[PDB]
Design a protein around this ligand. Structure first.
Ligand SMILES: O=c1c(Cc2ccccc2)c(Cl)nc2[nH]cnn12
Ligand SMILES: O=c1c(Cc2ccccc2)c(Cl)nc2[nH]cnn12
Ligand SMILES: [Cu+2]
Ligand SMILES: [Cu+2]
Ligand code: NA
Ligand code: NA
Lengths: 219, 219
């Protein structure tokens, strides 16, 4: 559905890597433009410090979405909630994206949007390549014989706004801890789909990442 | 205990990245030399294709360990087993290392050796930074409310040889699947300690990794 999705673009982190260029363009703008071109996307709520607004506002008349801003909160989830208060009163779906993932492919965004529409909550993920284990408080491996297949979550995270709101309300009403980027939905009974993305959708955290990102962009 | 540990250096993978230089020295030699200098280490069994033996044999008279070779097997575990058949009949401990991890620090090797001696089985690991979840066959997140803290396993993997042998025998006698780098020990009831290592102990898999490795070596 055209113009049914609101994007919350998380660009509130502080050194900032998401404004450093790749091929002359600030990292945040890559995903921003990917989303703007998609007919599905009605609006982009950028969550960023006022200082960086111009980075995005420069393109406002050139992009085929509405542009809005929200103020960052203290933790990532707070930034999500801030963006959430700015989305359209009738968008059917919210698409949360870390601006430090510039390389997300349109085709993968399309996938997670569809899955999110279908299921109600979906996140892009890839199978974890390393050997990963739970470790207990005595620093021992928690052993599994069964087939635990672990996936690394990326973004977008796509969710029906009502469902997200229900999660934030539960976490507030019960004072629940939020310890990774899917904790809010984990407290709900509603299913979360994992849409298979691409290993190229890396998050730029380190200086190493800047050249890797630039090197993928080479294509 | 001086000269109590046998190292199995896994260098049988095939493009090969573990022989590509960092600062002019083949990646495999970095960990090789780290181990050779440690008084604990009696011997290094290198598991590598005969073609590359000279890479290591060149240094034989210069290193304070015995050097032995084993032939790679088909899968990593087979390479482990091949090396295992070459270690000293009385070493108290075997230290399995991926040669593609050149940056392992002496101090972290010392830690996992101690832990392995104490517990019987230990592996170097670091806390996973990404959000990682189990995903079921319907591509849904397997939700946890509890505090699952996930760690990424590195090498060394340090184990009493008898315990390793018992694992390989069990996996053979029962035809058990080996699907990640701790599966053999997971079938045993004996505990596996996770020694906290360093995020710098990366595995060189990609071309990206070669520059990251080189860039860490800069120090
Ligand atoms: O559950 C969420 C979600 C919502 C979500 C999760 C997975 C799939 C779709 C939406 C978001 Cl966007 N951010 C955080 N931080 C902590 N938990 N959390
Ligand atoms: O359990 C092992 C071990 C032994 C081990 C695991 C963890 C700690 C110490 C030794 C090794 Cl070296 N390699 C593999 N491949 C598959 N399983 N597996
Ligand atoms: Cu990175
Ligand atoms: Cu890598
Ligand atoms: Na401009
Ligand atoms: Na030489």
């Amino acid at each position: 559905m055209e113009k049914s999705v609101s994007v919350i673009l998380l660009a509130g982190g502080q050194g900032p890597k998401q404004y450093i260029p790749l091929l002359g363009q600030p990292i945040a703008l890559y995903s921003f433009f990917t989303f703007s071109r998609m007919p599905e996307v009605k609006e982009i709520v950028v969550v960023c410090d006022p200082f960086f607004r111009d980075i995005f506002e420069e393109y406002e008349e050139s992009i085929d979405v509405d542009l809005s801003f929200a103020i960052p909160g203290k933790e990532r989830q707070d930034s999500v909630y801030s963006g959430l208060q700015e989305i359209d009163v009738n968008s059917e779906l919210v698409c949360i994206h870390d601006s430090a993932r510039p390389l997300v492919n349109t085709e993968d965004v399309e996938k997670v949007l569809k899955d999110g529409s279908a299921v109600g909550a979906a996140v892009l993920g890839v199978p974890a390549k390393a050997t990963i284990k739970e470790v207990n408080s005595d620093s021992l491996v928690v052993k599994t014989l069964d087939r635990k297949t672990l996936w690394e979550m990326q973004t977008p995270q796509v969710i029906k706004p009502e469902l997200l709101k229900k999660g934030f309300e539960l976490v507030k009403s019960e004072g629940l801890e939020v310890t990774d980027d899917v904790s809010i939905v984990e407290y709900l009974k509603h299913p979360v789909y994992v849409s298979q993305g691409s290993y190229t959708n890396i998050k730029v955290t380190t200086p190493d990442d800047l050249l890797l990102a630039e090197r993928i962009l080479s294509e």
